[PDB]
Design a protein around this ligand. Structure first.
Ligand SMILES: Nc1ncnc2c1ncn2[C@@H]1O[C@H](COP(=O)(O)OP(=O)(O)O)[C@@H](O)[C@H]1O
Ligand SMILES: Nc1ncnc2c1ncn2[C@@H]1O[C@H](COP(=O)(O)OP(=O)(O)O)[C@@H](O)[C@H]1O
Ligand SMILES: [Mg+2]
Ligand SMILES: [Mg+2]
Lengths: 372, 7, 178, 372, 7, 7
C-alpha cells in the first residue's frame, strides 16, 4: 500500500489530508492576502502574500482574493501559492513522493483540469495524480452505489445521478449558485436594516453571520408573516470590534435564494427543482430508486432545516406514491473529501493513476483519456 | 450607518 | 566520479567549531582574516556551484569542504530572492538585507546538517561563528549580484535563475521547501 | 562602527544624542534669545545672541523667540543657529562624521522637509540623513509592533495608528492644540487672580508654574464644585524674585482645555475624541488591538491623571465590550528620542539612509521618496 | 468563464 | 502656516 494525499481544494475552503483517515488533516479558507498599506516598522519581518488562516487573521490590512471562482481557477499564481502552502506548511510533506487525488466539479472547461495537471506535474513533480468528480466521491462517502448526489459547495452546485455504478452523464445538472452568491445577497439585504459591509475584509464577517445565524424556513410565506408580526426571530451578533447587530427577517431570506433564484435576478430554477429535473431526465425504471437515495453534501447544505425543506419540496413534485428520502448525514460538509480517502485507499485505484512517466510523453492532454 | 461606515 | 571539493585547506588554517575559518577578500566586518591571493573560498564556491548542484553524493573530506557546503547552500537562497528583482541596484539591496537576516547555525533547529556539523562549545565560539557566517553571507551575496545580472538588459539572466529548483543534495538553509 | 546622531528637534525643547544610548545627551529649550538693550560696560563680553540654556539663564535682558511653532519651522536663521549649537557646543562632534535622524510631525508643509534636508546636506555636509515621524518612533520605543500612538508635544498633537507595522496614513489625525496654547491659556486665566504676565521672559515662569502645579481632573465639574466649596486645592508658587502666588482653581482648568478646546475658542474636538475618531477611521478588524494598545507620549502628556481621564473618556465612547488600556511609560517625555536610537541602531536600517550621492543626483526632493 | 458569467 | 493659522 501507498499513502496518497487527498486534496479536495474546492472553491471556498481547501481541505487536504491523507488517504485512509476519516477527516481532512488541514482545512483552511482558500484566500490570498496582499498588504494595501506602506510598511513603516522595519526589522519586524514582512511578507508580500499571506495564505490561508494567516491571511484570515490579518484580514484588517489585506485584500483577500479568492483564486477559485464558481469552481474555476481564475488566477493560477495564487492557486500555486495555495497548493504550496497546503503541501509544505499544512501537511508538511514532500509532494514529490506521494500521489495526489484532486477534485473538479462536472461540466467545467477542459483547460482547467489541463492546467491543473500541468501544474501538479511540472511544479511539484508529483509522481502520479488523478482528477475525480466531486459528487462521485460524495457518493463513495455515503457507502452506496445508487442515488443522486446533490453537492452544493461554496461556488458551484451540481447534481449527479448514478445507478448501480453506471453514472448517467446526460442528466448531470450544474448550477452556478452557492455560498458566495448567498453571502453577496446577504451583504445586499443587510443594508435595508442599516448595516453596510462593503470591503472584502468584511465579507468574511458576513459569511460568519450567515453560517452562524441563517437557516432555511420550511414554509417561506408563513415564516415571513411570523417574523414580520413579532420580534421572536431576531438574533444578535457581535462584530469583532464590540458592535452588536440584530437581524430578523434576513435570517431565512439569505438561504431562501437557493430555492428561488429570482431574488438574485437569475432565471434558473431552484435547487429542489434542479434535483427533480435531473431525476426526471433519467430513464423511467430507475427513478424510484433515485427518489429514495437523494444525498446532500457541501457546506452550503448545512443550513438548519434544509433536509426537511428539500423533502417537502420534492414530495410536491413527485408522484404521490414515491417515497422521498433525503439522506443528509451530519458530516455532509467533509463528504466530498471523505469519499476521496475511500477511493485513493482502494487496491485497483493504483491502476488508475496518471504516472509522471505517462505525462512526460503525452503532455497535459492525457487527463482527458485517463480521467472522466 | 449603524454598523460599518458612520451614517 | 566525485563532486568538486575545495582545495584551500592548509595545516595552519584555524577552525571555528569544525569549519575552516578561511580568509576572505571582502569589505564587510567579520572575524575572518583578509586575503591577498586572487581566490578566496567564496569565489571558489561560486565557481563550483553550477556543477555541484547536479551531483547527489558529497563526501565531507575536511573543514574547508564544510565551509564550501555552507556557501553552496546559501547561493541557492540568494538565487531565490534575486529571481524576483528587476534591477541590479535592487538586487544589491536585497542581498544586503538577506545577509543581515540571521540564518540558523550548527546545533540549532532548522539547520539542515546538525549531524555533520560540530556546534559551538561555549558562548565566545558561538559569537565568532555567527559573525563569520554573517560575513560569508554578505560577501557571497555581493559577489553573486554581479554574476546573476547581465548588463545587456540589467535583469536576472535565465542562465542563473534556472538553478532555483536545483538544491545542493536537496538541503537548504531555509525551511523544507518553503 | 561609527555612532549616528539622533536629534529629536521638537518645537519647545530640542533633544539630541547618539544612536544606541538609552537617554538623550543634550536636552535644552529650543529658544533663541537676543538682547533688547545696549551694553554700557566694556570687557564683560557682548554677544549677538544666546541659544538654549544660556538664553534661559539670561532671560531677563533678552527677548526670546521660538524658531519652531506648531511643529513648523518659521524662522530658518534661528533654526540653523539651534542646529549649530547642537552639533558644536552641546554634542561636541562634527556633523561630517555621523548620519542624522531628524524627526518631524505628520501632515507638515513638504517645504519644511525639503529645507531641512537641504540645510543638513549643504550647510553641515553630513554623510547621510533620515526624517522620521515622531509617533512611529514612539511606537518603536514602546517595544510594540501594533497600537495607536497619541503624541502631544509643545507645539503640535497627532494620533497615528499602526497595525502589524502597516501604518494607515488615511486615519492619521493632527490637532494643533498643544502645550504652548495651554501656556497662553494659563497666562490668560491667571488674570482673574490678578497676576499679570505679559513679557516673553515671564512666559517661561508661567510654563514652569504649569508643569509643576497643573493636573488633569478626573471629573471636571466635580473638581470645579470642590474648589468652589473649599480652599484645599490651592498651591503656592515662589516667583524667582521673591514673591508668592496662590492658585487653586486654574490648576486643572488649564489642562482641561485639551479635552474641551472651546475654552480656547477652537471648534475641534478634544484629544480623547480625536483618538476615538482616529480609531474609528481604521478597519473594523483592527479596532480591538488599537483599543488595547493605546500609547501616550510627548511632554504634554505628563500631567497627573491624564491617563485615567483619557481611559474614562474613551471607555465612555467605545462599546462596553471592548477593553481599553492607556500605556503610559514614565519616560514618555523622551520616548520619541528613544525610538530614534532604536531606529538608527538597527542593522536592517543602513539601506534607508539618504546618501549624499542620492541627494546630489536627485535634489532635495528625494526626501519625499526615501522617507515615509 | 470566458463567455457568459465571469470566471 | 501660510494660509490658515500663523506658522
Ligand atoms: N454549518 C453551516 N451552517 C450554515 N452555513 C454553512 C455551514 N457551514 C458552511 N456554511 C456556508 O456554506 C458556504 C460554502 O460551503 P463550503 O463547504 O465552504 O463549500 P466547499 O465545500 O466548496 O468549500 C460557506 O461560505 C459557509 O459560510
Ligand atoms: N511635567 C509636565 N507637565 C506638564 N507639561 C509638561 C511637563 N513637562 C513638560 N511639559 C510640556 O511639554 C511641552 C514640550 O515637551 P516635548 O515633548 O519636548 O515637546 P516638543 O517635542 O514639541 O519639544 C512643553 O510645552 C512643556 O510645557
Ligand atoms: Mg464541495
Ligand atoms: Mg515632540
Amino acid at each position: 500500500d501507498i499513502a496518497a494525499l487527498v486534496v479536495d481544494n474546492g472553491s471556498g475552503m481547501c481541505k487536504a489530508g491523507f488517504a485512509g483517515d476519516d477527516a481532512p488533516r488541514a482545512v483552511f479558507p482558500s484566500i490570498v492576502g496582499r498588504p494595501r498599506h506602506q510598511g513603516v516598522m522595519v526589522g519586524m519581518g514582512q511578507k508580500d502574500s499571506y495564505v490561508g488562516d494567516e491571511a484570515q487573521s490579518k484580514r484588517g490590512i489585506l485584500t483577500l482574493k479568492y483564486p477559485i471562482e464558481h469552481g474555476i481557477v481564475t488566477n493560477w499564481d495564487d492557486m500555486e501559492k495555495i497548493w504550496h502552502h497546503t503541501f509544505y506548511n499544512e501537511l508538511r510533506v514532500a509532494p514529490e513522493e506521494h500521489p495526489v487525488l484532486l477534485t473538479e466539479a462536472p461540466l467545467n472547461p477542459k483547460a482547467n483540469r489541463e492546467k491543473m495537471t500541468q501544474i501538479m506535474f511540472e511544479t511539484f513533480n508529483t509522481p502520479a495524480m488523478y482528477v475525480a468528480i466531486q459528487a462521485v466521491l460524495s457518493l463513495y462517502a455515503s457507502g452506496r452505489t445508487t442515488g443522486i448526489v446533490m453537492d452544493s459547495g461554496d461556488g458551484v452546485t451540481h447534481t449527479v445521478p448514478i445507478y448501480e455504478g453506471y453514472a448517467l452523464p446526460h442528466a448531470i445538472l450544474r448550477l452556478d449558485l452557492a455560498g458566495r452568491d448567498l453571502t453577496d445577497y446577504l451583504m445586499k439585504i443587510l443594508t435595508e436594516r442599516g448595516y453596510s459591509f462593503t470591503t472584502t475584509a468584511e465579507r468574511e464577517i458576513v459569511r460568519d453571520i450567515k453560517e452562524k445565524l441563517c437557516y432555511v424556513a420550511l414554509d417561506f410565506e408563513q415564516e415571513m408573516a411570523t417574523a414580520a408580526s413579532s420580534s421572536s426571530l431576531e438574533k444578535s451578533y457581535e462584530l469583532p470590534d464590540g458592535q452588536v447587530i440584530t437581524i430578523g427577517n434576513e435570517r431565512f431570506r439569505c438561504p431562501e435564494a437557493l430555492f428561488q433564484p429570482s431574488f438574485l435576478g437569475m432565471e434558473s430554477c431552484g435547487i429542489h427543482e434542479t434535483t427533480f429535473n435531473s431525476i426526471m431526465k433519467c430513464d423511467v425504471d430507475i427513478r424510484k430508486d433515485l427518489y429514495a437515495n437523494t444525498v446532500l453534501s457541501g457546506g452550503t447544505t448545512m443550513y438548519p432545516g434544509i433536509a426537511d425543506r428539500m423533502q417537502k419540496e420534492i414530495t410536491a413534485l413527485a408522484p404521490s406514491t414515491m417515497k422521498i428520502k433525503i439522506i443528509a448525514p451530519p458530516e455532509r460538509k467533509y463528504s466530498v473529501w471523505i469519499g476521496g480517502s475511500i477511493l485513493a485507499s482502494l487496491s485497483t485505484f493504483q491502476q488508475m493513476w496518471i504516472s509522471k512517466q505517462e505525462y512526460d510523453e503525452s503532455g497535459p492532454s492525457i487527463v482527458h483519456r485517463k480521467c472522466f | 450607518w449603524x454598523a460599518x461606515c458612520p451614517a | 566520479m566525485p563532486a568538486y571539493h575545495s582545495s584551500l585547506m592548509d595545516p595552519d588554517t584555524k577552525l571555528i567549531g569544525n569549519m575552516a575559518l578561511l580568509p576572505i577578500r571582502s569589505q564587510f566586518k567579520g572575524p575572518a582574516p583578509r586575503e591577498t591571493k586572487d581566490t578566496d573560498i567564496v569565489d571558489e564556491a561560486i565557481y563550483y556551484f553550477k556543477a555541484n548542484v547536479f551531483f547527489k553524493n558529497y563526501e565531507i573530506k575536511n573543514e574547508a569542504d564544510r565551509t564550501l557546503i555552507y556557501i553552496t547552500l546559501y547561493i541557492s537562497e540568494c538565487l531565490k530572492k534575486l529571481q524576483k528583482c528587476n534591477s541590479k541596484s535592487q538586487g544589491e539591496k536585497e542581498m544586503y538585507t538577506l545577509g543581515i537576516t540571521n540564518f540558523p547555525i550548527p546545533g540549532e533547529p532548522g539547520f539542515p546538517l546538525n549531524a555533520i556539523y560540530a556546534k559551538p562549545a561555549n558562548k565566545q565560539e558561538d559569537e565568532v561563528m555567527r559573525a563569520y557566517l554573517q560575513q560569508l553571507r554578505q560577501e557571497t551575496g555581493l559577489r553573486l549580484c554581479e554574476k546573476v545580472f547581465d548588463p545587456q538588459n540589467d535583469k536576472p539572466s535565465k542562465w542563473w535563475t534556472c538553478f532555483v529548483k536545483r538544491q545542493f543534495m536537496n538541503k537548504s538553509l531555509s525551511g523544507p521547501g518553503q
